């Protein structure tokens, strides 16, 4: 194994979008090599675009990553079994495939599966086709739904055989009960059980839609279940469809570490989505709630002082928290990220902003900032010249002001005359953390 | 992938027998994806010698060849883990595995199967494990034999997915009826159906035995079903066992092109057997019958002169064939191997013996010799000292005689005084090929 | 050899900064055998960090580049094994090694040298150790300094024998007078003579220090001898040490083509320094003086429009240059980097700033900025929000102002109220490049 | 290291001339990798045939072998220093190179050396040029011979650096005294000291002559110093030249294990010489004396019975050695190989022929056979049908006779009538070793 990595990495060291690939490699250097990625795909894409999914899969595996790919044959089977016939039966709320449809789906996927594995190989990747035997599942209903079952135990045995070898495990979605009765698993129950078993770092659904949509119909650049979910279920414009995947993605992530994430995208924007700070697709985390409030008394000072000591590096001076006045407060449920407003000549003033190393990487330091600006469109703050984080402040503000030691910033459509006054004030505020 | 294929020629280009690999392999340009090779193995070898088969399979695939390997779990299943949980195997005709044994064989082979695929990768080969879903088979008997079935249709779909990628398709021996009923195919019916479907160039069973035996117990260097089979079934020393595989191998080849062949061997002699003109193991063809004749006139001279020019390397001098007298003639149907007797002072005398490089390797040069000695127990012939073949002549004869240039031989329980005369004649006979 | 060269492109073809290696390397198609790179190192690094230099050298050579490395044994010889047998080094001008120290330095470097070549091979590189016989040198002083000499003629014969084979020629720092008298060249005179002989494109000293320092003690991101040198010698904070290497590096480059450049760095920042437009270490060129002017007329417009089309990517609108008013103009001699001031309400205003990709990497875009600020302590300019350069503008300014599309900047100790006016002007100024 | 071998060997397994290359590889698998081969070369070959030596060297190294090559510049310097001048001085009995010739030979060889290393690389091999620093040597005479010295200690340090890397160490023949005085070593003293230090298995001198000559002028297919040497020094036709190399080669081998050998040949016959059982060049061993005699009483029976028990596998029946009559006896000094003649109806009869496994491989079983036939041109013997050694008997005889169990052979221009009688006798002789 330590053979392909070294160079594939001495590569990744110098690039614009490199720092965030070599490290996946090191993390899953070994053993959790498949713990890299799960990836679902609706029947359509593989059919109408056999070639793009394929071009994609071969980049992850060559980089050291390991897609463990799963596919259904929505459209090729959905339509191919009507050519044949006896296609209708969807008993409870989803598809019943009675004894007659068994041989079709085998033969179809298996056809396609290879089509995909070979499509994968065509693209320069390495992969193993693993189209039977992954899902042990119990058939739970004999009469009604016909011949459909449920994932009870997972033989990861096979995937690892492909992966260990640097192959993308291309699991199709069929299964065998443990006595052998071949069964059709609708792929979602499959993906879960699977994501469960594997604990990948990322899980993606490839569709032709290739992004998800807001009220205005634009692509959705991230969700945060932790906060967003309830609302999100509960809006009309959110069409029937969009409430359920969200149900399911919350479980998928509710059952993985948070360190996990998710996109849903079209193959073409696949590149821009995993490794950049904008992108084109939906990434979904569970992320964490933010706690708000104007009520300095509802917050844990012992604990926040405990938050602060770790982010920056100093403890607040004595008698300080008592003295703080305070306008509005944002603490994410775990007291590892927080934002605080005092006031000044009417201007909302950012007093302290502290995000622990773990929180920034989860992309949380960043949700925080967001309720803070939704609430304060006109905002002033200051900052040490070296706080290497200054750069994010310049990217976001509509104002700046630098002296040797300190730099006062502002964010709002104000003209400097106005600003100069509170700003002058801002340079004058004293240091809140002790000495240099 | 970069370093592999290349660092295989400018490697085997600095040695003596490099032309025979390029020439059997290039001639083995039956890529046809996987139409390369089928390969049975008895349960035993994988167990007691996981490592050998494995070392072997990795040479074919890196060379450009493509073993499509298949395996049962004879001993590992026969014994341990079937005897462990004390289930026990029930035989009616051959083995009945009733509903109880299903989970064991899956779980056992599947174990071992990966054991082998990983054994394969351990050895530096590329392979895919294809341990379920190749054999669609019908369970034909419900009550009696329990849960056992029969190959009706073959999804080569899988093998080609491994092979196409340069993987040794390592199909283990289980199957699914088309409705799904998991079933135990006893491997033979599997291999046939399979070899049927595939039409490989070569098909080899691997066993501990690693060779097959004659009357005297020595390894058997080739058979020729075409001629040998009838007798071969019909000899007592030929033990019960040895009659049937021959029954089956006749079918396997009877159902493949003749261009096909077959070894049965232990991993260790696998090297010497495929690509050399001696070897160590059993190669089996169907070959062709030879018809026996004294009739110079019933033979194709234009064509034999065509056979001779290729074996040795000179053409017969003018007016020769017409001149040739001829006591008796053996040509294998294809005019690529032949043996000819003239006469001399009563002694049957080998005049010419030519077997083309292809025929030698098929083990046919060698059937030819056989009717020739069944017919002439007392025999004389001669030969050049360098004809590197000489060794075989000395292994066989019961006489020799060497002078710098030529060497007269004889094969018969005669005392030199008798012999000396025809022999002296033998040295005297002139060269039949030019300078 | 098969797997190496190839598994280097379809590898660095699936990443963002792959064009800059292909483009500095292909542009670095100064194979000229070894005319690739020279590389000094102080005794220390090889000792305390045998492994780093080593990890480094193996990247150049596998890439197609060819480090011709040279080494002294500063610390290993200075201390241990010279202090061990208690000989001790005698300095008159710099170091005298009288007859007694000969065997030590041979034996020491030669040790270490292999240590490095093997360190090199450990790292997956290819190299040849070339630890005697490169420096033919004359011992000029017999009595005083003891046994020390001077490089008169260079046998590159050896280096090319290692390099031609894809070996990092690892010349250690000993020499033989032409009659044979083994001699200790203090390495500098060696490196010069050597860089002289070789004409590499780049030449780098490796030290623990791994960067060079300014007044404030920060790493120095580039010098420009052409302009900087005089001042540079002539500053007190510039400590004794820092004046001389600069003396020597001026000569080294004064004697190479300008196309040459130079880092001085610690192994760890070696990556970021050669192939990026920021980096971490000292790059030194001779660069060229800039002459200072307010005379629009003394500048080559056809040629500047030629400079501008390349940096940004649009051409100026018609009748423009004629229109341009112009307070002051900085063009580096080569018309590949330039800065221009118009005016506005009294404020010097940066109108255009264009540095071609080549100039940036030479660290020249950056000298330019320098006379521009020495001249205009109070300065205003503007900029697109995306011009990925913006960051440098924010690192420098003492003012900013952002709106969706554009961003007005300023650099001076002014209070926003003053500024707001010219700034409001700044946002108002129209685009100078088309759409 | 275990990287290049495996395949380079799975290669060598099937060939006509293969069994005798893979094993050199295994022997010198590691560590004694340079203990593979030394190789000298006269100035001429590298000049007039830069390309052949070169084509040669690259086959050994690619096969796993490791030539450690040494060269002088006989002709290119011999002639190039007369262009210059002051070329004459050969003080004792060989060449004096006074202070003036130092810079020439450096500069010449070093030129050529690289020429050879590059010639080596041109040929597809891997090599390192190691043209200074191998020979530490003392200059022993200051005034007379000018500036020439003598090999006192050997830094093998360098060779191993090339070899370890799979390079053919191409040592040129210059040296440095330990204080540094550059000196010219005439290459022979160099080769010895070197062969000494290295203990290679084979050592070869490449010349344009490319073989050595007998009385009749034909190429000499092997010598055996052990026996041949005294005579060999002592024959007139043996010209002045041919007595001395033989002096030197005896020392070279007298100071290496016997397991060693030697050819002297032209590059073109280099292929046929190391790996076949004829060849074209001279191979030289020390080999071992053969002891002869008709005197059964001068031989060690306890010991021969000790020889016999190991070769075949049986001990002679009781009272046997006493009974043996005996015509002529050949024992090589070490009692590990022997040949014995009794008589029968006048015909010299080979009674026992036993060569221990070690002796056959030294090629000694084979010298033995040779005095035995020089002495008995008409010879009869017999042999078991399976004694796998039968084949050598057929290659050599001018007669045969096979029955199921035994086979009677003869060697001589006799007609079978004559022979049949002693032969009939031969089949009738009883087994000398006990039962099957």
Automatic annotation (TrEMBL), chains A, D:
The lineage of its organism: Bacteria, Pseudomonadati, Pseudomonadota, Alphaproteobacteria, Maricaulales. Pathway: Amino-acid biosynthesis; L-arginine biosynthesis; N(2)-acetyl-L-ornithine from L-glutamate: step 2/4. Residues 288-434, 291-434 form the N-acetyltransferase domain. InterPro entries: AceGlu_kinase-like_sf (IPR036393), AcgluKinase_fam (IPR004662), Acyl_CoA_acyltransferase (IPR016181), ArgB_GNAT (IPR011242), Asp/Glu/Uridylate_kinase (IPR001048), GNAT_dom (IPR000182), NAGK-fArgBP (IPR041734), Vertebrate-like_GNAT_dom (IPR006855). The keyword Acyltransferase applies. This is Acetylglutamate kinase. NCBIfam families: argB (TIGR00761), PRK04531.1-1 (NF003386), PRK04531.1-2 (NF003387). CoA 2 binds at residues 403, 410, 414. It comes from the Bacteria. GO terms for molecular function: acetylglutamate kinase activity; ATP binding; L-glutamate N-acetyltransferase activity. It holds the Pfam family AA_kinase. CoA 1 binds at residues 216, 403, 414.
Automatic annotation (TrEMBL), chains B, C:
It catalyses: N-acetyl-L-glutamate + ATP = N-acetyl-L-glutamyl 5-phosphate + ADP. GO terms for cellular component: cytoplasm. Residues 288-434, 291-434 form the N-acetyltransferase domain. It is an enzyme of class 2 (transferase). CoA 2 binds at residues 403, 410, 414. Its EC number is 2.7.2.8. CoA 1 binds at residues 216, 403, 414. L-glutamate binds at residues 353, 382. GO terms for molecular function: acetylglutamate kinase activity; ATP binding; L-glutamate N-acetyltransferase activity. Pathway: Amino-acid biosynthesis; L-arginine biosynthesis; N(2)-acetyl-L-ornithine from L-glutamate: step 2/4. This is Acetylglutamate kinase. It comes from Maricaulis maris (strain MCS10).
């Amino acid at each position: 194994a330590p053979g392909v990595r070294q160079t594939i990495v001495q590569l990744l060291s110098h690039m614009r979008d490199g720092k965030e690939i070599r490290e996946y490699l090191h993390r899953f250097s070994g053993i959790d090599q498949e713990r890299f990625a799960v990836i679902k795909v609706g029947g359509a894409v593989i059919q109408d675009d056999l070639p793009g999914l394929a071009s994609a899969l071969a980049f992850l595996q060559t980089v050291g990553l390991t897609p463990v790919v799963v596919h259904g044959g929505g459209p090729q089977l959905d339509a191919a079994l009507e050519a044949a016939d006896i296609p209708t039966e969807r008993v409870d709320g989803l598809r019943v495939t009675r004894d007659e449809a068994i041989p079709i789906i085998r033969d179809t996927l298996t056809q396609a599966n290879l089509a995909l594995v070979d499509a994968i190989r065509d693209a320069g990747g390495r992969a193993a086709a693993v189209p039977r035997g992954v899902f042990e599942a119990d058939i739970v209903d004999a009469d009604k739904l016909g011949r459909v079952g449920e994932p009870r135990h997972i033989h990861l045995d096979l995937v690892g055989s492909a992966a260990r070898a640097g192959q993308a495990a291309i699991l199709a979605c069929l299964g065998e009960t443990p006595d052998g009765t071949l069964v059709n698993i609708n792929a979602d129950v499959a993906v879960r059980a699977l994501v469960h078993a594997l604990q990948p770092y990322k899980v993606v659904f490839l569709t032709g839609t290739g992004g998800l949509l807001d009220e205005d119909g634009d692509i959705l650049s991230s969700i945060n279940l932790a906060t967003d979910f309830g609302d999100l279920m509960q809006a009309d414009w959110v069409n029937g469809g969009m409430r359920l995947k969200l149900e399911e993605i919350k479980r998928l992530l509710d059952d993985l570490p948070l360190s996990s994430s998710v996109s849903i995208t079209r193959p073409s924007e696949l590149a821009r989505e995993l490794f950049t700070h904008a992108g084109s697709g939906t990434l979904i985390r569970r992320g964490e709630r933010i706690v708000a409030t104007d009520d300095k008394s509802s917050l844990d000072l012992g604990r926040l002082d405990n938050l602060v000591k770790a982010a920056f590096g100093r403890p607040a001076v004595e008698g300080y928290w008592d003295r703080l006045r305070v306008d509005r407060a944002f603490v994410t449920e775990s007291y590892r990220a927080a934002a605080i407003t005092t006031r000044l000549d009417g201007w909302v003033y950012l007093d302290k902003f502290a995000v622990l190393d773990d929180a920034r990487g989860e992309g949380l330091g960043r949700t925080v900032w967001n309720r803070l600006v939704d609430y304060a469109p006109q905002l002033i703050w200051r900052s040490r010249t070296n706080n290497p984080v200054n750069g994010f402040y310049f990217e976001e503000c509509d104002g700046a002001v630098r002296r040797d030691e300190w730099t006062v910033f502002w964010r709002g459509e104000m003209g400097p005359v106005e600003v100069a006054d509170v700003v002058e004030k801002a340079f004058a505020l004293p240091p809140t953390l002790e000495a240099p």
